[PDB]
Amino acid sequence: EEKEILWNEAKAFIAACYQELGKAAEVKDRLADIKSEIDLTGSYVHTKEELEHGAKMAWRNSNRCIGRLFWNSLNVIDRRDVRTKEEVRDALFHHIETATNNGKIRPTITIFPPEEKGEKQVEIWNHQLIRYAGYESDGERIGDPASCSLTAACEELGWRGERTDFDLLPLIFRMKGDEQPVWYELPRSLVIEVPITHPDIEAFSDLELKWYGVPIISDMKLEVGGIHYNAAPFNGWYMGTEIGARNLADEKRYDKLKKVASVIGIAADYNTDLWKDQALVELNKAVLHSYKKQGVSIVDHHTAASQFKRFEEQAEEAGRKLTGDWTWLIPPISPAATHIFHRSYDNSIVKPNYFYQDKPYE
Amino acid sequence: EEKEILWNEAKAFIAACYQELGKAAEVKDRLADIKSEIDLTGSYVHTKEELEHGAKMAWRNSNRCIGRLFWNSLNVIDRRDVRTKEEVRDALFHHIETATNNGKIRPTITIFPPEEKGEKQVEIWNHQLIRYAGYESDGERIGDPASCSLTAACEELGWRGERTDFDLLPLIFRMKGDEQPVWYELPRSLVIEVPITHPDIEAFSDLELKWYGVPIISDMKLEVGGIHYNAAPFNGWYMGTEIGARNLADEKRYDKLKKVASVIGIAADYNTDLWKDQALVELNKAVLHSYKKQGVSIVDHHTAASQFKRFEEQAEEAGRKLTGDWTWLIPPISPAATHIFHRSYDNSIVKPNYFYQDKPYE
Numbered sequence: 001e002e003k004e005i006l007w008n009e010a011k012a013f014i015a016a017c018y019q020e021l022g023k024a025a026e027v028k029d030r031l032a033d034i035k036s037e038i039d040l041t042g043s044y045v046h047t048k049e050e051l052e053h054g055a056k057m058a059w060r061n062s063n064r065c066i067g068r069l070f071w072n073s074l075n076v077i078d079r080r081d082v083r084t085k086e087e088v089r090d091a092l093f094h095h096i097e098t099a100t101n102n103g104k105i106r107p108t109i110t111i112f113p114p115e116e117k118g119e120k121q122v123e124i125w126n127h128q129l130i131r132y133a134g135y136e137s138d139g140e141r142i143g144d145p146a147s148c149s150l151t152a153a154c155e156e157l158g159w160r161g162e163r164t165d166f167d168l169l170p171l172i173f174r175m176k177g178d179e180q181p182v183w184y185e186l187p188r189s190l191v192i193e194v195p196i197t198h199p200d201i202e203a204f205s206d207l208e209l210k211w212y213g214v215p216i217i218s219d220m221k222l223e224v225g226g227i228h229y230n231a232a233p234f235n236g237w238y239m240g241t242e243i244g245a246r247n248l249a250d251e252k253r254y255d256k257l258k259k260v261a262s263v264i265g266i267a268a269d270y271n272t273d274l275w276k277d278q279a280l281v282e283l284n285k286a287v288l289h290s291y292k293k294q295g296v297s298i299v300d301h302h303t304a305a306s307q308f309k310r311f312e313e314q315a316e317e318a319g320r321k322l323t324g325d326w327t328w329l330i331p332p333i334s335p336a337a338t339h340i341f342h343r344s345y346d347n348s349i350v351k352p353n354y355f356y357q358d359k360p361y362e
Numbered sequence: 363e364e365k366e367i368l369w370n371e372a373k374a375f376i377a378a379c380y381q382e383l384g385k386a387a388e389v390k391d392r393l394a395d396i397k398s399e400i401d402l403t404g405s406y407v408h409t410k411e412e413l414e415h416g417a418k419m420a421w422r423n424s425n426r427c428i429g430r431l432f433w434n435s436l437n438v439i440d441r442r443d444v445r446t447k448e449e450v451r452d453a454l455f456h457h458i459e460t461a462t463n464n465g466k467i468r469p470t471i472t473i474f475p476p477e478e479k480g481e482k483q484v485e486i487w488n489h490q491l492i493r494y495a496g497y498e499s500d501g502e503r504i505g506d507p508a509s510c511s512l513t514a515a516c517e518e519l520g521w522r523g524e525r526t527d528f529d530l531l532p533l534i535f536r537m538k539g540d541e542q543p544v545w546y547e548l549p550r551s552l553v554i555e556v557p558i559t560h561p562d563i564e565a566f567s568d569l570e571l572k573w574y575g576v577p578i579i580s581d582m583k584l585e586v587g588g589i590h591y592n593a594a595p596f597n598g599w600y601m602g603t604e605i606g607a608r609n610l611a612d613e614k615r616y617d618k619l620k621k622v623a624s625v626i627g628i629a630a631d632y633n634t635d636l637w638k639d640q641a642l643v644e645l646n647k648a649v650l651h652s653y654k655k656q657g658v659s660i661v662d663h664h665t666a667a668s669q670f671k672r673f674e675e676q677a678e679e680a681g682r683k684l685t686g687d688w689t690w691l692i693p694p695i696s697p698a699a700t701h702i703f704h705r706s707y708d709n710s711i712v713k714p715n716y717f718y719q720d721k722p723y724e
């Protein structure tokens with residue numbers, strides 16, 4: 001059943017990919033090559049072209065992603081050659097540097113060897129390559145609660161955080177054949193961070209908020225023609241609401257709205273004053289302002305939705321079915337001010353795609 | 363098949379209703395009565411208790427409604443006795459007066475005779491009993507575009523609007539046996555309207571915005587134990603976002619955000635300034651402030667979501683399955699600031715319930 005699922009996914013992916021690449025005549029012979037390679041080895045190896053286009057298709061098919069207009073410009077780095085933990089570390093460090101690009105963020109994915117027997121070659125423990133630690137002691141919370149369990153697992157491995165609200169977690173990953181992951185502190189020269197200030201309200205800096213420049217998701221599986229690349233970190237740039245309306249605002253995250261209300265000079269006493277809404281808007285204005293001022297890429301939710309509308313128009317004109325998850329595509333502030341809120345989307349799963357996988361800790 | 367659908371719905375409703383009313387022992391004999399009444403007449407007549415509880419259950423089962431905590435206090439007015447158009451008019455006028463209650467809004471439903479052969483006895487054309495007209499001429503828009511087609515149909519019947527942005531549509535409805543609906547101008551003494559002012563920004567009144575106090579939906583079918591009450595207008599009070607974030611804000615409605623930005627003193631030039639978001643928050647603050655100042659009931663979306671959380675807790679403790687439509691329950695501003703955004707809901711249809719029906723015009 002395994003070779004069979006693999007062969008079926010392979011046939012479908014190659015046909016579609018080669019059709020998109022104008023290589024339809026090559027499908028028959030490539031599929032023959034593949035079928036015998038599966039017969040003899042139990043798997044097959046993608047060409048560089050397939051791997052690159054596969055990763056781009058996978059982004060294009062990500063139902064929850066508002067940023068998909070730019071799917072065809074994904075920078076794909078092929079690291080299927082790595083064998084050692086130093087090589088993995090250096091490839092992750094490199095991804096950070098080249099994706100960051102001095103603030104002008106380049107959407108990039110680095111692809112490591114794929115699972116074999118469902119056996120991982122490289123197992124990345126981080127949720128994102130750059131993220132902040134979280135702690136709970138004396139019922140007192142420090143840092144990012146979403147990082148609590150991974151932070152605890154790193155401290156089990158001999159790492160120790162400074163317990164600021166913004167400790168950078170080390171890279172942490174396990175190699176096939178090793179019982180424990182290794183961890184490596186991030187060089188600070190590689191990590192751009194943005195202090196959050198407000199364009200008009202000077203007191204806003206009293207909150208001492210900041211966030212990191214580049215979100216690099218490192219715990220999803222890329223699936224392409226039946227091959228499972230469980231280790232394939234990827235980044236875009238942030239949409240400002242992700243930081244201003246969720247990471248810094250959620251009660252179960254940094255929970256800053258009451259403090260925001262206070263520095264912007266409004267009472268946080270009555271639901272009918274809409275103080276949370278007002279605090280949310282000023283915090284989100286500050287986030288966009290701060291990234292722009294530092295020369296770090298970011299997009300506001302209005303511009304992002306306009307780009308997404310173009311993606312829809314592009315799909316239609318290319319004759320491709322559009323799929324989407326309305327509940328994730330609407331931004332968490334003023335969603336009815338975007339066109340997204342007012343239409344519906346088919347939430348069917350199309351492959352290639354990025355998928356959740358079980359955490360190796362907790 | 364018709365008597366069969368009716369009998370099946372009847373059995374289910376009576377059992378459930380009598381169980382809730384502590385009258386389980388009466389179900390067997392009531393169902394016998396019903397079965398022969400259906401045999402002999404093709405239908406059956408609800409007792410006053412069934413009709414009242416049926417309407418309350420229908421509200422409780424409305425997946426899209428955030429205001430359901432208060433389902434058991436619905437005021438049910440039984441007007442199954444009406445036979446004449448004057449009687450219908452006077453019952454609609456009465457509903458407006460008693461629901462409005464001098465500003466302290468009472469959730470009320472008036473129930474007219476139900477369909478017989480699928481033949482309507484009373485056919486109400488209005489979407490709400492109180493709503494504003496809409497016009498399009500010279501490509502120039504006046505009033506509420508959502509009312510354009512009904513406005514055109516009323517003007518076909520000899521009504522003429524003044525073409526202000528807030529013309530009250532007449533009541534318009536058709537009686538069984540009549541080829542055309544009749545229309546009746548609303549007495550202005552019955553209609554509370556609220557001028558929109560802002561608690562801090564004096565210039566806000568320059569926009570000359572207002573809205574009506576009481577939303578009274580008059581075009582949905584109430585279905586209870588297989589009986590189709592196509593004419594059964596009902597009201598609650600407004601949640602402020604319905605007015606401030608949609609009716610007055612949508613581009614296809616009153617489209618006021620640019621004007622709002624202007625009177626609150628912000629530029630409406632750059633997406634990254636989040637001027638639409640900021641305008642939305644100030645407009646919504648003004649709406650809540652204005653209703654409160656006039657002594658007309660209204661609820662903000664934070665309080666409404668807290669009430670809805672109680673409805674969920676109440677369902678669970680009563681052992682009732684909860685159903686809901688996440689896409690409609692989230693408010694259109696700051697939805698991630700409510701608990702609703704962060705959980706999921708079963709969108710199954712349970713009866714009794716309120717349903718859309720085809721418009722008799724257009």
Ligand code: HEM
Binds near residue numbers: 059068
């Ligand atoms: C270029 C700028 C990009 C922007 C502005 C953007 C925007 C977003 C946003 C706002 C989300 C929702 C995240 C959340 O609420 O937690 C998202 C989800 C997602 N994006 Fe994108 N994205 C971009 C690029 C990319 C790239 C390069 C990929 C992969 C190649 C990608 C794949 C995804 C996936 C898989 C999700 C869903 C994550 C999940 O289900 O948890 N995106 N995107």
Ligand code: HEM
Binds near residue numbers: 470600661666690
């Ligand atoms: C008491 C105060 C109430 C509040 C604050 C409230 C709130 C709301 C809101 C905000 C909506 C969404 C409307 C839209 O976006 O167009 C809604 C939908 C709805 N409500 Fe309520 N509601 C209340 C009372 C009632 C009552 C008394 C009934 C009937 C007995 C009712 C039945 C419904 C139904 C059927 C819908 C869905 C309409 C549709 O699908 O188009 N509600 N409610």
Ligand SMILES: CCN(CCc1cccc(F)c1)Cc1cccc(NC(=N)c2cccs2)c1
Binds near residue numbers: 234235237238242
């Ligand atoms: C933690 C919140 N987001 C994912 C939600 C999640 C993740 C892991 C486990 C969960 F249960 C839920 C993170 C995320 C995912 C995808 C995109 C983004 N935002 C971005 N702009 C990008 C990150 C990488 C490419 S684009 C954030």
Ligand SMILES: CCN(CCc1cccc(F)c1)Cc1cccc(NC(=N)c2cccs2)c1
Binds near residue numbers: 577596598
């Ligand atoms: C026109 C927008 N709303 C319904 C959407 C709709 C209506 C008719 C046809 C459509 F295609 C779509 C109106 C509505 C419906 C239900 C409740 C409310 N708001 C209220 N607070 C109440 C009105 C009546 C009881 S509560 C508004």
Ligand SMILES: C[C@H](O)[C@H](O)[C@H]1CNc2nc(N)[nH]c(=O)c2N1
Binds near residue numbers: 327328704705706
């Ligand atoms: C239950 C609900 O679907 C869930 O909490 C979602 C809602 N939509 C979302 N949308 C985005 N973009 N990100 C999120 O974390 C969530 N949370």
Ligand SMILES: C[C@H](O)[C@H](O)[C@H]1CNc2nc(N)[nH]c(=O)c2N1
Binds near residue numbers: 342343
């Ligand atoms: C397509 C989408 O589901 C639709 O436009 C909805 C979204 N959620 C909504 N929710 C409410 N309460 N009211 C609405 O009119 C809408 N519009």
Ligand SMILES: [Cl-]
Binds near residue numbers: 215242247
């Ligand atoms: Cl994030």
Ligand SMILES: [Cl-]
Binds near residue numbers: 577604
């Ligand atoms: Cl309305």
